[PDB]
Each structure stands twice: as structure tokens, then as C-alpha cells.
Amino acid sequence: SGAWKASVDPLGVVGSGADVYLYFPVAGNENLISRIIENHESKADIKKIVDRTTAVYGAFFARSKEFRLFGSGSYPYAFTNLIFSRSDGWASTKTEHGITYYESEHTDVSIPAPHFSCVIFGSSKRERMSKMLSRLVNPDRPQLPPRFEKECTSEGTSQTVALYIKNGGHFITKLLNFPQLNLPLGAMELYLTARRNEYLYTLSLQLFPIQFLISRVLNAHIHVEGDRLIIEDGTISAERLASVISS
Amino acid sequence: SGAWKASVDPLGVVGSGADVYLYFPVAGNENLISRIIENHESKADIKKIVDRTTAVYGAFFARSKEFRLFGSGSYPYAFTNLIFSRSDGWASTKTEHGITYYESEHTDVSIPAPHFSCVIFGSSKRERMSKMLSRLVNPDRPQLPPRFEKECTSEGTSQTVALYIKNGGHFITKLLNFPQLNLPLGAMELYLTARRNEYLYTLSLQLFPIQFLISRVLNAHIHVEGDRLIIEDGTISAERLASVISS
Numbered sequence: 001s002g003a004w005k006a007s008v009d010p011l012g013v014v015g016s017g018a019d020v021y022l023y024f025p026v027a028g029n030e031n032l033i034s035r036i037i038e039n040h041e042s043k044a045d046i047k048k049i050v051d052r053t054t055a056v057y058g059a060f061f062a063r064s065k066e067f068r069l070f071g072s073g074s075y076p077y078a079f080t081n082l083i084f085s086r087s088d089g090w091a092s093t094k095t096e097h098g099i100t101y102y103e104s105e106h107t108d109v110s111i112p113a114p115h116f117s118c119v120i121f122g123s124s125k126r127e128r129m130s131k132m133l134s135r136l137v138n139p140d141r142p143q144l145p146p147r148f149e150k151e152c153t154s155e156g157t158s159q160t161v162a163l164y165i166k167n168g169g170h171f172i173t174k175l176l177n178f179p180q181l182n183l184p185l186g187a188m189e190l191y192l193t194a195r196r197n198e199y200l201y202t203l204s205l206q207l208f209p210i211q212f213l214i215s216r217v218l219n220a221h222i223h224v225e226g227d228r229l230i231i232e233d234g235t236i237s238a239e240r241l242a243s244v245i246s247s
Numbered sequence: 248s249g250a251w252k253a254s255v256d257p258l259g260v261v262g263s264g265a266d267v268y269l270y271f272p273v274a275g276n277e278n279l280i281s282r283i284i285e286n287h288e289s290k291a292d293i294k295k296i297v298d299r300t301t302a303v304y305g306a307f308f309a310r311s312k313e314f315r316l317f318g319s320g321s322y323p324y325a326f327t328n329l330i331f332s333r334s335d336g337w338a339s340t341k342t343e344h345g346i347t348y349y350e351s352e353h354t355d356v357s358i359p360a361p362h363f364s365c366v367i368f369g370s371s372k373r374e375r376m377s378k379m380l381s382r383l384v385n386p387d388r389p390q391l392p393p394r395f396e397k398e399c400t401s402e403g404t405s406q407t408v409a410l411y412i413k414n415g416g417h418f419i420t421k422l423l424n425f426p427q428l429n430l431p432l433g434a435m436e437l438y439l440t441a442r443r444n445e446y447l448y449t450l451s452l453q454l455f456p457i458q459f460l461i462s463r464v465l466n467a468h469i470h471v472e473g474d475r476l477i478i479e480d481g482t483i484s485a486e487r488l489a490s491v492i493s494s
């Protein structure tokens with residue numbers, strides 16, 4: 001057909017209903033990627049993949065304990081077969097329509113067309129690859145905040161990392177250390193953009209004396225547009241940011 | 248006499264009733280001093296003074312707009328005359344008891360005995376040198392927080408910078424930028440100790456969901472001993488700390 005390939009919507013392919021959404025454009029973030037991936041065994045192969053990748057769209061589903069990724073890039077058969085023919089623990093099979101399904105113990109990968117990859121990782125309850133792939137024809141309709149949508153628009157335009165968390169509450173708490181004082185935090189948005197060797201950030205948190213005080217201790221700004229608290233144009237080192245992701 | 252010299256109490260000499268008290272021991276803080284004083288005209292002479300100085304005790308009085316300093320150190324006549332004979336705008340006179348009073352347009356300095364200096368800076372309303380000097384015989388009885396007293400005890404023991412602000416409220420606000428939302432902040436204590444090229448800090452503020460959250464964004468710790476909020480073993484760069492003092 002290739003008619004589906006006319007208008008692929010990456011967010012519709014990862015799926016609606018997720019707890020966390022990520023946009024990660026590679027260009028302008030190569031430094032950070034390197035820091036995060038400087039400690040691995042596949043560092044050489046991951047860098048070759050990064051060189052082939054424009055942007056990653058991700059979604060985490062807590063219920064089924066899974067991550068679904070859509071990689072926009074360039075993954076010709078020779079390069080994917082090259083990567084696969086090195087790795088251990090990976091198996092591969094070719095479906096009736098010739099598209100390769102790669103399978104690992106917790107991870108599935110397909111390359112349905114040469115410009116994109118679909119990756120599904122997690123528990124035995126993670127989505128079937130063929131189900132994700134069906135959304136190449138009938139995409140989901142996820143609801144995403146305005147600036148998240150902006151960064152995803154016209155792939156190649158943005159170098160901003162975007163993260164959208166439906167419930168800031170049981171994401172901060174239910175992460176690693178788990179006491180329940182039940183912080184009444186709804187939707188959370190986080191945007192990250194590089195400058196020299198630092199990251200400019202913007203954080204929105206769904207909820208002015210302690211406003212100006214925090215505007216001084218944490219970089220420079222505070223805002224209130226009603227429901228939300230907005231920490232704008234803050235700063236963080238590429239160094240600490242990678243330590244956050246390490247978890 | 249020299250009988251007064253048997254037990255000089257530096258805090259009693261700067262005076263009771265002040266708005267801010269400072270303890271600044273030189274050793275272990277030479278790096279910081281350098282950063283603060285790297286931009287001056289007297290940098291050479293100040294370093295020679297720093298080399299002669301064990302600890303500074305300070306007090307700021309808002310009402311009379313003055314700072315009173317007691318420097319414990321070694322300031323022999325040859326060295327003070329050396330410093331004075333270089334400087335412009337300074338005059339000197341010898342009192343009936345032979346002790347030298349140095350005078351500048353906004354600043355008075357005496358060396359009542361070779362191991363200490365008394366410095367009074369500020370408006371035309373600042374204390375008379377001879378009045379400060381009387382407290383070498385009849386010291387004031389200032390009231391200071393326990394850890395402030397600890398750092399001042401046994402001169403040479405501590406490398407911790409200690410700051411005590413009677414009213415955190417109109418010190419943060421009434422500094423530089425002055426809007427009045429009237430933050431109900433009473434006494435404030437701040438302690439600063441060097442490690443490699445960073446400063447470990449402890450801040451107490453007179454007033455647990457946002458407690459653990461701030462314990463994560465600002466270094467590592469929060470406490471509540473009743474009236475006070477205690478930010479313990481926090482961290483700051485020698486670099487930014489000097490920019491704070493620049494004001």
C-alpha cells in the first residue's frame with residue numbers, strides 16, 4: 001500500500017491512555033545521550049542507532065507495565081541486520097508481508113518501513129507488536145498539552161525534550177521511595193532545552209510570598225496562570241540531569 | 248594596665264542590640280576571601296591584612312547605619328604604619344595613652360593593643376571609636392544563638408562562617424528590592440563551612456509534604472524542631488557565594 005505511510009502520526013502509534021509521554025529529539029542532545037549511555041555494553045551500537053535517529057516518541061503504561069517507543073529515523077535492512085547479527089538473546093521472524101519482527105525476552109522491535117522503528121518493552125503483559133502496528137493505519141487519539149504538541153510538530157524543528165505526566169502525584173512519590181502523604185499534584189509538564197553545557201528547563205505543575213523566594217533559590221522565575229504553577233527558564237547541569245535518568 | 252587585655256570578649260566589644268552579627272574566621276576561607284577581593288584596588292594590602300588576621304567579629308546596626316568590626320590578629324605598629332603610609336584619604340592621631348586612631352571619611356580604625364583592631368564604618372551617626380573602646384573594660388552582653396557561640400569559642404578551633412540575623416523578614420525583603428508582602432520570618436541563622444571548592448551550609452529560619460520535596464531540590468535535608476525550619480548540610484559553590492557578598 002504505502003498509503004498509510006503518507007501520514008504517520010507517531011503519538012497515535014504509541015497509543016492513547018498512557019501515564020507518561022516523552023518527546024526526545026536527538027539533535028542538540030547528543031552530549032546528553034552520550035553521558036547517559038557512556039556506561040553500557042552496547043554503547044557502540046546505540047551510538048550507531050542514535051546517528052540514524054531523528055526523534056523518539058515514548059509512552060509509559062503503568063497498568064500493563066510497558067514502554068512503547070516510536071523511533072523516527074533511517075533503519076535500512078542492511079543496518080538492522082548488521083545490529084541484530086551482532087547481538088545475543090535476540091531472535092527474528094518475517095511475517096507474511098515481509099516485515100521483520102525482532103524479539104527479546106522483555107522487548108519487541110519492528111521496522112515496518114525504513115524510516116521508522118516501533119519498540120515495545122516491559123512485562124509479559126506488554127502490547128503485541130502487531131497491535132501497535134495496526135495503529136499505522138488506525139492511529140489512537142492521545143490528548144497532549146499545547147507545548148508538547150508544539151515540540152513534536154514539524155520533525156527536525158525542535159531540540160526540546162518534552163515530558164508529560166498525567167499524575168505528578170504518584171510519579172514523584174511512587175518513584176523509588178514510597179511514603180503516602182498524598183501530594184495533591186495533578187498533571188505535570190517538563191520541557192528541556194540545551195545551552196552550552198547546561199539545560200534550560202520549564203516545569204508546569206497542576207495545583208505570592210514563597211513565589212519570589214523560589215524564583216531566587218531555583219534560578220530565575222515563577223508564574224501563576226490559574227490551575228498551574230510555572231517554573232520558567234530554570235537551569236540544570238547536563239551532569240545531574242543524566243543521573244536523574246539513570247533510575 | 249593590661250588587666251583588660253586578660254579577658255577581651257570580641258562580641259561584647261562590637262556591642263549588643265545589633266541587627267546582624269557575623270563571625271568570620273580566616274583560616275579555611277582564604278580561597279573565598281580571594282574571590283571576594285580579587286576585584287579591588289587594595290587587594291595587595293587586604294591580603295597582607297588577611298595574613299595578619301585570625302578572625303573577624305562583626306555587627307550591623309540599621310538605626311545608626313553602621314558596621315562595627317573587631318579583628319583578632321597581629322597588627323604591630325610597623326605593619327599598621329606601613330599600611331597607613333601607603334594609603335590616601337587617611338589621617339591619624341595619637342591619644343593621651345599613645346593608642347593610634349585612624350580616620351577616613353566614613354571609617355574609623357584603632358589598634359588598642361597589638362593583637363586586635365576595632366573598625367567602625369558607616370554614616371555620620373556611627374559610634375565614636377572611644378565609646379567602642381570603652382567596652383574593652385566594660386563589654387556589652389549580646390545574646391547569640393548556641394551554634395553561633397560555639398563557632399566563636401576558642402579562637403582557632405572553628406573554620407565556620409556564622410551569621411545571625413535578628414529579623415530574617417526585613418533583611419531578605421528590605422535588601423535591594425523592596426516590596427511588602429510581609430513574610431512572617433523572625434530570627435535567621437546561617438552557618439558556612441568549606442569542603443574542596445564548595446561550601447556546606449546550614450540555615451535556620453524562625454516560623455511535611457513540601458519538606459521532603461525541598462530536601463531533594465535543595466541538596467539533602469529538612470528538619471523541624473518546633474519554632475524553626477532547618478535546612479542542614481546543603482551545598483553552594485564558592486563562586487555564587489561570593490556574588491551574594493558582592494552586594
